[PDB]
Amino acid sequence: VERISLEKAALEFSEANAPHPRIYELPVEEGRSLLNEVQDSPVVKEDVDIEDIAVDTGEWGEINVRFIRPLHQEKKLPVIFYIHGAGWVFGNAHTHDKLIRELAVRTNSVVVFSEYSLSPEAKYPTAIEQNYAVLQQLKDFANDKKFDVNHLTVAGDSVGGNMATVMTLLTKQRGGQKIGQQVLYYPVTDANFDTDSYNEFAENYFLTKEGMIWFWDQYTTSQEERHQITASPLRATKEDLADLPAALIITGEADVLRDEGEAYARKLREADVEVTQVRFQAIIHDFVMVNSMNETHATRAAMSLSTQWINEKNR
Amino acid sequence: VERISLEKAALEFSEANAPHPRIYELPVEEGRSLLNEVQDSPVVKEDVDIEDIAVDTGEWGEINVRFIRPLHQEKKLPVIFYIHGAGWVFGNAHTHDKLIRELAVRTNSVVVFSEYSLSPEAKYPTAIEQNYAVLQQLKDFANDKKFDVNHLTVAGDSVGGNMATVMTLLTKQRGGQKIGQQVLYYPVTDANFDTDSYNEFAENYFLTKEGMIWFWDQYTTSQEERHQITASPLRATKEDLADLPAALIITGEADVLRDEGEAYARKLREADVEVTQVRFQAIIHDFVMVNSMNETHATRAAMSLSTQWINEKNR
Ligand SMILES: [Cl-]
């Protein structure tokens, strides 16, 4: 099979995910299991205290929220609100465990991780409403969980990066809990399947054009919903994006979502938002989450850049 | 006229250098003055101990070699050999002052900065042999200057990056002083003017196609010499590149040199060399050196990544 230059682990993850049936061609409960089994593979995880709290989002129901804290910290820590990815269909505290532990320890922060309702059982805009409601209840936990809600970062990977930047939109529109800055790992920004990266990396790079069409189909099949800026933030006007929190936007070269991530970065920059946009060569979608890609140069450099950038923000 | 999305400081520096005559249309002496003047503009510089030594390169004559040291450091520090850019025609310890002080402090390293002979007065291969000569003498200054030669990083910007990576090939060919790793900021890697980035960014982004044609003409007009892997390292075979030191290669989006930098990273990775390749969006050539670009998101992210990458190496 013909591919561009990739890190060994990215090539191996691409080859391992080429055979049919792929993850998005399984009954959604078997897909969810397969990602869990993928994320059982060997990795060194930083050390944290974990607390699972049921949080009531009101109209949008009760979800588990996981609170993660580095060991032996007496002081009031900054807080990171982390929204997981994996296509609105998969993922949980276990799939993203290595990533959020690394963020907690290297930024010396509490990580708050919403287990939002998954598609297709939950449709747009349930996940974004539940995530926005948890953000409004962070002040309610700030004292018992020893974090400072005035040192607030929102972050997410893929579909989670989509909802993370959408948290900044909803907050500006509804005057909610101030967000200092946002970190989007290889986000979804648009329900369009015709960008040059979508065309070039359509097949053979683990995340496929066909799979992304399916993920959007699980989230909502309404064109009117997909055109809302809280589904496709790439569609935001200059006036919509003005005064949003400072953003770090990380892309990989061999990713269908590369161009829409880089395009969204240019739109924020044109709206005078502070933007740090970096593309890592020779790497595929999902590289800061997947355990087997934990050692890639892209992963090591992405985590060094992201943790440092947040550390600089908090002080 | 019109440019892709750029950071404010990159746009301003592009416009300032739009009108004729440009720096490469001046006599070489006014060229050198213009760049010295540009680097008089105000910027925060870290504090350091500085020391100008004459070093004898044998055949290629005696050159000034600057040692930079972070204040109040009672240990043997790691060392970085830094080869400056600016087209082989310009640059000196003044033009690169801000950058080498930041590298010294944030890596807690001595910075050894060879003031190699400039072109056209000197031709290929003088500058690379002088730089190579100083490398083999580092073990001899190691004690007065308290550094450990077994924690040796070579680094360079643009033609400095060219000559830095060429130091690693000469070292391998000759059994010279072992280099741990190499940092290339937007390197020159090939005497070809026909890459997609050369065409797209040929004009309006400060560094022009015509500018690079002239810089190469000052260095050597010989097509035979340009085909040499010690002039155009992109032309190296897999066998030439095998076992070279671990590489960090940084590129800017809005840079004629972007593609040949990215292409050289692929060739190193295909030769099983450890490569960290990162492209920063919306930034022009020279962004880690030029004082007026010191606060760009690109410059801050490139300094944070490259300094942490070097620190992790020195363990
Ligand atoms: Cl299918």
Residue numbers in the entry:
A (entry chain A), B (entry chain B): 2 to 316
Original authors' sentences:
In this study, we performed an in-depth biochemical and structural characterization of a novel microbial acetylesterase, LgEstI, from the bacterial fish pathogen Lactococcus garvieae. LgEstI belongs to the HSL family of α/β-hydrolases and presents a clear substrate preference for a short acyl chain and an acetate moiety that are suitable for the narrow entrance to the active site. Monomeric LgEstI exhibits a canonical α/β hydrolase fold with conserved key active site residues. The active site of LgEstI has the typical catalytic triad of esterases, identified as Ser159, Asp256, and His286, and is located at the bottom of the substrate access channel.
The three-dimensional structure of LgEstI was determined using X-ray crystallography at 2.0 Å resolution. An LgEstI crystal contained three monomers per asymmetric unit. Superposition analysis revealed that each monomer was almost identical, with a root-mean-square deviation (RMSD) of ~ 0.3 Å (Cα), including most of the water molecules surrounding the monomers. The CAP domain is made up of three triangular helices, α1, α2, and α8, whereas the α/β hydrolase domain consists of a 90-degree twisted β sheet in the center, five neighboring α-helices (α3, α4, α6, α10, and α11), and turns connecting helices and strands. Careful investigation of the active site of wild-type LgEstI indicated that two of the three monomers had a triangular blob at the tip of the hydroxyl group of Ser159. The crystallization condition included 0.1 M calcium acetate hydrate; therefore, we incorporated acetate into the blob as it had a 0.5 reasonable density fit value. The acetate moiety was positioned at the bottom of the active site and surrounded by Val160, Met213, His286, and Asp287 within hydrogen bonding distances, and an oxyanion hole consisting of Ala87 and Gly88. The oxygen atom interacts with the NE2 of His286, and the methyl group of acetate is directed toward Val160 for hydrophobic interactions. Unlike other esterases, LgEstI contains bulky residues such as Trp89, Phe194, and Trp217, which block the acyl chain channel.
